[model samples]
Target: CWLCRALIKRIQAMIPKGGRMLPQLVCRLVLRCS
Candidate 1:
């Protein structure tokens, strides 16, 4: 759980500024892969 939290934090940091993809889209893609 900690690892997952940390990973999410890192991903949040890496999130592109003005990225075209919405948060929901990113969630969907991550879920699809996981």
Candidate 2:
């Protein structure tokens, strides 16, 4: 498994309702989680 993927899934801190873990690019650009 990708180390980055595992990290992102754990950061579901701001996903709200989306069950699936978001991509790094999307999280950094769209969601912009702190």
Choose the strongest candidate by TM-score: 1
lDDT of 1 by residue, 1-34 (tens): 1244455556667875655544444555565563
lDDT of 1 at 1: 14
The local lDDT score (0 to 100) that residue 26 gets in candidate 2 is 65
C-alpha TM-score for every candidate: 0.37, 0.32
lDDT of each: 0.54, 0.58
lDDT tens digits by residue: candidate 2, 1-34:
2355555767666565776545776645644534
Decoy 2 TM-score against native: 0.32
Q: Candidate 2, which segments miss by more than 4 Å at Cα?
A: 13-23, 26-34
Cα lDDT over the full model 1:
0.54
lDDT winner among the candidates?
A: 2
Model 2 clash pairs?
none
